[PDB]
Amino acid sequence: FLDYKIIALLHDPPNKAWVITGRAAKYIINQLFGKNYSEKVDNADKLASSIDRYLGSIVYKERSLFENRSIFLKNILLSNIQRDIGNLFPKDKSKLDNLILEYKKLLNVINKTNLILKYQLFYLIYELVWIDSKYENTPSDTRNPTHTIFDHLYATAAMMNWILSLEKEAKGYLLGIDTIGVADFISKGRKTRDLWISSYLVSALLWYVITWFIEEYGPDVILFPSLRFNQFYAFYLLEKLRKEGVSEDVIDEIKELITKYIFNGDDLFENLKIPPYPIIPGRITLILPGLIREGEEYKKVQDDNCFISKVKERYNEGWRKLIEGLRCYSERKREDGFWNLVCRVLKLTEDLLQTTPLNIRVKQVSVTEDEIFNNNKLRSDSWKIYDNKYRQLVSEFKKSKLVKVTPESRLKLFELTKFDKLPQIGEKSKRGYEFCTSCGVLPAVVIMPKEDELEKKLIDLGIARDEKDVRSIKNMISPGERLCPWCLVKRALGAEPRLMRILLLGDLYSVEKIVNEIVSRDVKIEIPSTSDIASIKTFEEMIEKKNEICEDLKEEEVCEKPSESVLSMWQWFNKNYYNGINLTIDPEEYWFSEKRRRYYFSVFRRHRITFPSPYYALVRADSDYLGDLLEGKLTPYLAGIIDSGDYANISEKKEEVNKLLEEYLVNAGSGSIVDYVKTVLKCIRENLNKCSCAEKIYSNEVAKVMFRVNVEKANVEEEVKNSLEYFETILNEGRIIVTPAWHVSISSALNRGLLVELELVNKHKGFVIYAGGDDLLAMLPVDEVLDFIKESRRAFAGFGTEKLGNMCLENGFVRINNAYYPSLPIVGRSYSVIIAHYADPLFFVINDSYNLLEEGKEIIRYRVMYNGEYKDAKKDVAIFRYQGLTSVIPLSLKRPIVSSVSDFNEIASIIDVILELKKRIDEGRISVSLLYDYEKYKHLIVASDEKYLTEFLVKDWIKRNSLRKHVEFTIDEKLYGVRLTIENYPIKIPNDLISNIVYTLRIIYGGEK
Amino acid sequence: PYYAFAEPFFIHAITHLHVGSGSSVEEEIALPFQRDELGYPTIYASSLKGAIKSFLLKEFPDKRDVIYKVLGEDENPEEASLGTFLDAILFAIPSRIIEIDSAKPYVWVYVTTYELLKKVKLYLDSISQLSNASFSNLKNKIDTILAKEGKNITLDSDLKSAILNEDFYVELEALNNKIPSIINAGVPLLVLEDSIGREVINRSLIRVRRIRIDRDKKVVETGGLWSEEYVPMKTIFFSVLLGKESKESAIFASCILRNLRYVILGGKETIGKGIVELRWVKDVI
Amino acid sequence: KRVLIKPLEPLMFRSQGEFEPLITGSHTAAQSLIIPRPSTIAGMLGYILFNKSSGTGDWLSDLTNLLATIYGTFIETNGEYLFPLRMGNHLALVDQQHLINLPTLLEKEYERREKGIYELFYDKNKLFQIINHQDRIGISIDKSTRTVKEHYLYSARYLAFKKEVNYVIFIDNDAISDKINGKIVNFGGENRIAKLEVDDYKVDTSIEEEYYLALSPILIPDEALDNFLDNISDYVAMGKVDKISLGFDIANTKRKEMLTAILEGSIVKRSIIDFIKNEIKNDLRYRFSKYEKIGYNTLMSLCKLALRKILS
Amino acid sequence: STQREYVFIPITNSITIDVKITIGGSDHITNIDERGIHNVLVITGYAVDEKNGRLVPTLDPCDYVKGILVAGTPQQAQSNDFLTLKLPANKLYLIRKKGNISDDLKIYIPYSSPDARNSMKTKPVSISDDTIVNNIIKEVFDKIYNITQKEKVKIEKVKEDIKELFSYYALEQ
Amino acid sequence: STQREYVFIPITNSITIDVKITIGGSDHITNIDERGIHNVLVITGYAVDEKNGRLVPTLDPCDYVKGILVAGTPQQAQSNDFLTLKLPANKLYLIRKKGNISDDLKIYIPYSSPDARNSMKTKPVSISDDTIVNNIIKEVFDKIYNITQKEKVKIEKVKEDIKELFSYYALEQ
Ligand SMILES: Nc1ncnc2c1ncn2[C@@H]1O[C@H](COP(=O)(O)OP(=O)(O)NP(=O)(O)O)[C@@H](O)[C@H]1O
Ligand SMILES: Nc1ncnc2c1ncn2[C@@H]1O[C@H](COP(=O)(O)OP(=O)(O)NP(=O)(O)O)[C@@H](O)[C@H]1O
Ligand SMILES: [Mn+2]
Ligand SMILES: [Mn+2]
Ligand SMILES: [Mn+2]
Ligand SMILES: [Zn+2]
């Protein structure tokens, strides 16, 4: 039997530090059977993390051998930023049952014949109502406060699946999914409608496939991304219960409990009826047992193929559901316009659409009883497989990555193209067929007349069945466009995204139920085109002064009433829709239009208001060396000093890698156990190399035994040998040991970051396209880029000049109002920013942003400060490009990034410099020539290495183009000798920082012409 | 064969010259010339063909049929063209000079480098096997020059030393032979090492700041300021007009090309740029 | 026996945006291929050798009638042979010096692979020392006005060559190569020019090795597509596949076809060969024989220059 | 420490009198677990001399021979005509990497005398006549793997898979 | 009959006495053709024993050692510790292959014993310290090229070619 993981999950409550050695299972259960432990949850506690093998082999199972009244709280990555859990504790012992009544506030509305709900509905709200008790986020083991309590309570439930797979007789699998070409698929689009919905396509298509998983096995079978703050799992579970059928009062226990934490906005999954942000990673792993759910029980079959194909069929089944739902919708709607077209084509082509425009890989490694056990216990090298099997998985991945199968290579076109067997709508192409202007790699089936009589020209072609539908046609499809089947699907799905619900639920409803629920509710959804975001201030200059500077525009339906219902996923559309101005205009029709332009140019001048700027800003981010950190390497700790390739024979870096883990591992302890390690560590080359160094000093463990003695034997010639072999296999090879706890903690930390940068983006007039665990994509006005980065980088490391939605962004952690949650400061993060004309093809902008940061991360070294001396790092850059004016701003100038608790202002300091400079250039303190005269001082500055000569040269260049004579804005000295070591590439980058400070402002002040 | 004959020719800039390329902001001009792949100026074959097509259609308004045959149609883009230009290769840019105890005192010289000559020899060698194009003195001289690669060479055995474009001091040495004047100007030709030749040539190009002025109060308008490169006068580009076998091609080459001395190339014709003299390499050298 | 194609100027092998491996701030709708598909080489030769008497409603029947089996093509700079290489949307041009131990590299330890192949594509790569990507924007002018026409503004990324490069093909027949020597031919796209020269040379023939270098696209016959791709790690070690067009036939004036192909510069495990020799029913076998004839299914041995057709 | 020794697989019965070892220890590296032959070794620049088997050092980089490494050492009257080295566990290109590394490994190999009198050259040959491996697994690979015919259920699987996974170069001189 | 022999080109000076018969007859295959050195033979699966450095065979083509060939026999007092062999000129693969070979040639490669005490941590070796090439030209190039100071005069690039083109491997020991 499975799904009883509540006791596998709650093998001990978050009251752990409140039952351990004072400061007050003590409570087992009141609404379930007794939790069994012969070796059942024993393994769940011992194999889930290293804390039971890092500190000895029995201390964690005793929870009293090195105790202490004060309980630290350490970061999992850099155990130096501290937190203290103090006295405040889960609500009083005398009322400890009330919270259980608060447990039972919504677990008693639906039948308790099945656990596939009664176990997982609480999963997501477990962490929620608990922080309403404000429990202050205790750690799991107080002798090692590196893993918070809830994280371990989930990590144990993770490998509980493998426990049960050994409880049948033996099985267990690590399956990994990953869609193949994402950055390619996203490239196809024309108005950012297609962009955001192709992102949402990747996301929802991968969300469809693991719904089945969480219904056959329940969550916590998934490792990445953590199903903790999933904006998709939230909506999914929520609508599951809504279809289960309960008064909005009955769900109101969960609705606000979400909206206050997740979905911190107003327009949410109940106003768009869709999650306004795609957050699923295009690749996800799974720890899968050998059981099979087909009814009433869980049977097993010994094969591995029972998943490799049963996941592919589900992935394609989701696409089939979507395409047939679009068939039903376009049928139910031909009487509008532009839907006649979608029906007509889905009938003119059906078989090309029988294969999804994405692909996936799937690898799935095994596990057995052999060498995981002998009879009933764990042997030497038994904690040493999970990360082994994990590496096996990622090795299969990166081996198969050598080949690339683009989706189209699946299509059966040969006959359809050799002869006129391909259907064309519009002009039967003179040359046999055309390529769609969006993919450029497929034959298009809709070919708009370019422009001569666009009104008649297509009414001259029977595509326009009558004089009416031409508006709904000419709206969603620009003249001259050419659409393949796959891109007409996306143009349609951009006409409305609500049909993606068919993909969300993993076939929970029927398809007709979904589409006919959404043909009743009828509401207009809008998506910000590049022309919109390139006019943000242009509306603000017309929002503060509504009609004060609008009198002639009072008739052009821009200064007029927002009419029906229009609502967007764009948060800045939820906070200015009712400002009187309709953000539903098409700015390419009034002033970003050609004929109606010069009029407006003489119009705005008398109201003394600017011409708008034809530039948005495609920001994207990336976490440098994320894979090595999940694998468990130190390239994230030393981004630039060591590369992946310097891990083939890691024995050369035995200076760096052997440091920087000690100071973490040896410090990750506290109290007295720290000394337990603070001596035992170096005694390998420092000592007789074998298990007799610690035997001398082991005694300060046995120096606490007899107060309530429980232990069976004190003859530790093994727990000194085992705590030596542990560190020997990990310093002899200077990697880390990876745990389920490691992974789940990092994925959760990625989800908190997801929330916080989702708030960051729309804090500015941003527009998310894809907020991911370690990545991002957005469009911002060219005025809010730097200040954004400057925080989003900092915020990623965990640092707040502000409360974001309701999350406290402290130093090193992200504390949810009592829950100090660890952030990822040690993880690097690069940025890539493109200042793009609104009339630029998105295909190219996306490609040359992705590749820009794609090779920019892997090409540019800069002079950094490691161990106090000077090294050359390779990642954590912030690249810009106007159109041929590339610029690069580093972001750390230290390695590791923040090795001290107050290093949190080293990060992105350069952009503070650029802000203090740009702020004063335009205030009339410093002339415009500051950026035209550097081409006279640059040579001396880069030829200098006596930093006070350089300081005086900079001071002179600042002073000689000052409008006053009395401004004294100085650059820090440390920004003088750094050098941007780019090598052998036709891209042009200045080889000294201040030139890049100059070029960044060149770009940005140029993004306003 | 389907390229029966080829007529090489030089292109002497009579006025300054601006054949423009994609305006941008990275190279700090606003409007550069057309770089080839090594940064040297070059006239794309499309620009050559289009400009010469327009000139000929204006001049000979009857042979419009023959011109539309050889160079192609525009209302019937069905039948291809019987003739093609190769991208005009920069041959010799004119440079200022200051003599240093040298016999004949010059104030300007022609300057080449060794990539430019490698490309010129590529063209010539490639078209040589047509039985109509011999001019073996030309590629003879080009080859004896290329033999001496790696040294600032002068085709006039008296300079021995110079300062080019008031910035670059080059110490010369003669080709150990007379190698008669390739280009019939009474001016010495200098073939330079590549690294220094690129400097000298980039500094031989004209770069102009231009402005737009309000006619009322004679003050510059906002945003009305840019810059652009011209190729100087006296500059020589090299190209070839490749033709196929037909008899419109023959009548073209027999009377269109006998009378084609001056042509208007590139942009900014109102400013005077773009006049060019085409020298057919079948009589000279 | 071996034909050298020397471009006299940058060339345009229009590829339908098949790739995005470059950052140049261009947005020029038309980019160019590094190595022209064998259809282009075949069409150039057939344009030289065409006689207006074989007129047939099929373009590759007519083409195959003219020329003997052509083999794949690669780079010859200074005698130095350079062969393509792909890593899933990463082109490179490397020598067999770097191919010799390449199969032994393909299965090495994780980090061994990463270091080796990245140094192969990022330092051992001789592309940019050979190829520049020259953006060219053209316009059209209405002779009436002397200003630019409306809607006539095209752009193309030509393939310019820094140092003088040749494209190397091997032809079987010996009599047509007589009328291929010294031919100034109109190689490629936007009316560009190259020179054909033919030379007696030596080359091995169909050695039985383990790994093969896909010197030219391997077409997959649309019946084996599902079967093939669904076990793709069995046939290609490192490379990429894609649904590529075949070109444009001059007589009929339409696009030729669209087939899935194993793009050039791929590494393929010998297995693939038998695969092709299995799913080829006599009729599609006829088709694919003509395809292989014009130059498509060409493989090279990673240890020495030994060409091999898959079928023949 | 630990030791190893080389075995090669031609179509001839010239491996029989090689080693005085069955396993050496209790474990091996070339595992065979219900998916055919794995962990196969291939080494480049060698030619097989099947009649009185010996491994000519040839200078063709795709003159490859397939071998397997198991702890052993032959007959105490060798290592004067054979070669030897202690590879660092990773200079050994092996197909289907499954077995890991223990910081070192000592390996001897049966080396062929140059035969530096005649013009030497080889030709590629692949395994045939299934009977060969049928009696080799009982001539050598049971002498090195006792689990043969006792643990697997498909001996034909390994027949066909060692068939398709081996190929080498016979000197024919 | 015609014969050849492999010469390795190190940076560490070991070529004081490595050949006696250099020229002898008419020709040596490794020549320069107006653009630098041609036909540089690469060999795979080898390593050096740098302390009194001669050749030893490792077991991996991932250590490619690149040298030249010259005719004759050096000092005619070894092959008791050399790899002296013969191949019909087709089984070895040189770069910049110029023309038609004679199709049989000797190879006297300077071999050395493995001495498998500690492992061969092989490491890629580019040729740096320009002065070392400037002295090796007289330590190998000129002393085997009497055509130097006669026909081929460009000593300039013939260094700069093999400032990358002579690449081999080492042991760190
Ligand atoms: N739903 C999504 N929307 C947008 N971008 C996404 C999405 N999911 C993943 N990505 C990003 O897409 C990019 C692709 O990463 P990568 O792992 O290199 O896969 P790829 O680029 O798609 N192809 P491949 O590397 O062969 O797997 C990364 O930035 C991902 O984080
Ligand atoms: N093991 C993993 N599990 C899940 N997602 C991953 C994993 N490794 C990488 N990703 C994500 O998928 C992409 C991996 O490609 P990439 O980001 O280029 O690699 P990386 O491991 O992050 N190293 P780097 O090149 O520095 O970025 C990124 O979008 C990651 O966030
Ligand atoms: Mn991908
Ligand atoms: Mn990453
Ligand atoms: Mn990447
Ligand atoms: Zn399309």
* Residue in chain B nearest A882 by alpha carbon: B25
Q: Do E and C touch, counting CB pairs below 8 Å (3 needed)?
A: yes
How many angstroms is the resolution?
3.1
Rounded to a whole number of angstroms, the distance from the CA of C299 to the nearest CA of chain D is 16
Residue with tokens 């919905």: A197
- Describe the crossing of helices C110-122 and A386-400 by its angle, rounded to 10 degrees: 30
- Angstrom distance (rounded) from CA A647 to CA A652: 9
Q: Is A829 in the pocket of ligand 2 (CB under 6 A)?
A: no
Token pair, residue A1002, equals: 């060149």
Whether the CB of A1006 is below 8 Å from some CB of chain B: the reply is yes
Please indicate whether, in this complex, the C-beta atoms of C8 and B21 are within 8 angstroms of each other: no
- Residues with CB under 6 Å of ligand 1 are A 178, 180-183, 186, 199, 202-203, 278, 280-282, 401, 404, 770, 772, 775; C 88
Cβ within 8 Å, pair C109-D44: no
A410: left (phi over 0), alpha (psi -120 to 50) or beta: alpha
Helix, strand and coil percent figures for chain D, each rounded to 5: 10, 20, 70
Q: Exposure pattern of A937-955 as b/e (b: 16+ CB <10 Å)?
A: bbeebbebeeeeebbebbe
Residues recorded for chain A: 1009
**Residues C311, C288 contacting (CB under 8 angstroms):** yes
Contacts of C141 in chain B (CB under 8 A): 50, 54
| CA nearest to D45 within chain C | C303
Beta-carbon contacts of residue A114 (< 8 Å; ≥ 6 apart): none
Q: Is the peptide bond before A145 cis (omega within 30 degrees of 0)?
A: no
Residue A382: phi, psi to the nearest 5?
-110, -30
Atom of ligand 2 nearest to the CA of A281: 5
Comparing CA positions, the residue from E95, E120, E81, E107 lying closest to residue E31 is E95
CB atoms within 10 A of CB A982: 18
Cite the annotated binding site of A for Mn(2+) by residue number.
Answer: 178-180, 622-623, 854
| A775 Cβ closer than 6 Å to some ligand 2 atom | yes
Nearest CA to A482 out of A421, A423, A439, A531 is that of: A439
Nearest-Cα residue of chain D relative to residue C111: D90
Question: Chains contacting C with at least 3 CB pairs below 8 Å?
Answer: A, B, D, E
Instruction: Quote the CA–CA distance of A495 and A194 in Å, as a whole number.
Output: 10
- For testing contact with chain B, the best of C136, C184, C196 (most B CBs within 10 A): C184
CA of A291 to the centre of ligand 4 (A): 34
D98: CB partners within 8 A, 6+ apart: D31, D38, D39
Residue B219 has what DSSP assignment?
Answer: -
Q: Extract the annotated binding site of A for Zn(2+).
A: 436, 439, 484, 487
- Report the nearest atom of ligand 2 relative to the CA of A875: 26
Alpha helix ranges (H) inside chain D: 131-136, 155-165
- Whole-Å CA distances, C300 to C127, C237, C261, D46: 20, 14, 17, 22
d(CA D85, CA B231): 68
Distance of CA A194 to the CA centre of its chain: 21
Please indicate whether, in this complex, the C-beta atoms of A988 and B26 are within 8 angstroms of each other.
yes
Which amino acid, one-letter code, is at A101?
L
* H-helix or E-strand spanning residue A853: helix A842-857
Between the CA of B21 and the centroid of ligand 6 the distance, in Å, is 31
Going by their DSSP bridges, the two strands C81-86 and C91-94 should be labelled as antiparallel
- Provide the pairing of β-strand A403-405 with C236-245: parallel
Q: Distance from C75 to chain D by nearest Cα, in Å?
A: 23
C207/D95 touch (CB, cutoff 8 Å), yes or no: no
Do A961 and A933 meet the contact criterion of CB atoms below 8 Å apart? yes
Q: How far away, in angstroms, is A858 Cα from ligand 3 center?
A: 17
Q: Which residues touch B21 (CB under 8 Å, ≥6 apart)?
A: B32, B33, B34, B35, C137
Q: What are C276's two structure tokens?
A: 């092709």
> How many helices and strands, by DSSP H and E, does chain A display?
38, 25
What does the block give as tokens for A49? 């993390």
CA C274, distance to chain mean position in Å, is: 23
- Ligand 1 atom index nearest CA of A773: 31
Measured CA to CA, the distance from residue A37 to residue A53 in angstroms comes to 19
Q: Which residue in the block uniquely carries the two structure tokens 């070029």?
A: A999
Residue A436, judged by CB atoms within 10 A of its CB (0-12, 13-18, 19+), counts as buried
Rounded distance between C-alpha atoms, residue A329 and residue A326, angstroms: 5
| Closest atom, ligand 1, to C-alpha of A278 | 1
User: Measured from the CB, is residue A469 less than 6 Å from ligand 2?
Assistant: no
Partners of residue E152 on adjacent β-strands: E148
Q: How many A from CA of C87 to the centre of ligand 5?
A: 13
- Cα A448 from Cα A483, distance rounded (Å): 9
Nearest CA to C222 out of C258, C247, C196 is that of C258
Determine the residue of chain C that is closest to D99 in CA distance: C109
Give the helix/strand (H/E) hosting A314.
helix A305-331
Instruction: Name the residue in chain B with its Cα closest to that of C165.
Output: B122
Which backbone phi and psi does B189 adopt, to 5 degrees? -105, 140
CA of B41 vs chain A CAs: smallest distance (Å): 19
Are residues C263 and C219 in contact, defined by beta-carbon separation less than 8 angstroms? no
Whether the ω angle into residue A896 lies within 30 degrees of 0, i.e. cis, is yes
Would you say C198 and C1 are in contact if contact means Cβ atoms under 8 Å apart?
yes
User: Does any CB of chain D come closer than 8 Å to the CB of residue C108?
Assistant: yes
Q: List the residue whose alpha carbon is closest to atom 2 of ligand 2.
A: A627
Q: Which of A180, A182, A851 to mutate to test the pocket of ligand 1 (most atoms within 8 A of CB)?
A: A182
> How far apart are alpha carbons A770 and A682 in whole angstroms?
46
Which H or E run contains C272? helix C271-276
* Cα–Cα distance measured from residue C201 to residue C177, given in angstroms and rounded to the nearest whole number: 12
Collapsing DSSP states into helix, strand and coil, what is residue B43?
A: strand
C282 touches chain B (CB under 8 A): no
Tell whether C195 is within 8 A of chain B (Cβ).
yes
The candidate with the shortest Cα–Cα distance to C110, out of D95, A392, A874, is: A392
Relative to the CA of C89, which ligand 1 atom is closest?
26
Ligand nearest, relative to CA of residue A851: 5
Alpha helix (H) residue ranges in A519-624: 530-533, 536-540, 571-574, 597-606
Sign of torsion, CA D43 D44 D50 D53? negative
Q: How far is the CA of A899 from the centre of ligand 3 (A)?
A: 33
Contact at 8 Å (CB) between D127 and D166? Answer: yes
How remote is the CA of residue A407 from the centroid of ligand 3, in Å? 12
Contacts of C303 in chain E (CB under 8 A): 93
Atom of ligand 1 nearest to the CA of A203: 1
For ligand 1, atom 27, name the residue with the nearest CA. A180
A177: which residues sit within 8 A by CB, 6+ positions away?
Answer: A206, A209, A210, A283, A284, A285, A286, A311, A315, A360, A361, A362
Give the ligand with the smallest distance to the CA of A625: 2
